[PDB]
Amino acid sequence: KVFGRCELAAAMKRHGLDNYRGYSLGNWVCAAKFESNFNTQATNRNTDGSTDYGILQINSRWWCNDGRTPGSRNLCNIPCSALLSSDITASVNCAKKIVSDGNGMNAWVAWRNRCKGTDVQAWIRGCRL
């Protein structure tokens, strides 16, 4: 499923991401935009044996189990396939865990490179929230 900007904002907000650990909703929308272009089915297969999964491109080495990645930690305790769902719940639950496990939003290269420092509030401007 390919989300609209405002639709994703709403869903993220209902899942409690607005101000989670001090990151305003717009940072989360911005991360998803540049990680996956809002595509819940996005996958990125890396040369390192790991794969990035879903709307926030969560990596298989540390966060989920795909059964094919070396050094697998499965810290979100889920199969990577749960991250390819049209419903964003599993992705949101794991993102919160990533931020809880001693990482900021810097765990997302796209956030660091394309959102950090910008006016992220643009991403939710005009939306019903």
- Report the side by side order of strands in the sheet with 58-59: 43-45, 51-53, 58-59
101 is in an annotated binding site: yes
User: Would you say 105 and 116 are in contact if contact means Cβ atoms under 8 Å apart?
Assistant: yes
| Amino acid at position 13, single letter | K
β-sheet bridge partners, residue 45: 51
**Annotated catalytic residue within 52, 66, 87, 119:** 52
Q: Catalytic: which of 35, 48, 66, 119?
A: 35
CA distance 11 to 81: 20
Asked if 52 is an active-site residue, the reply is yes
| Rounded Cα–Cα distance for residues 119 and 121 (Å) | 5
Note if 35 is an active site residue.
yes
Binding site membership: which residues?
101
Please list the active-site residues.
35, 52
Binding site membership for substrate: which residues?
101
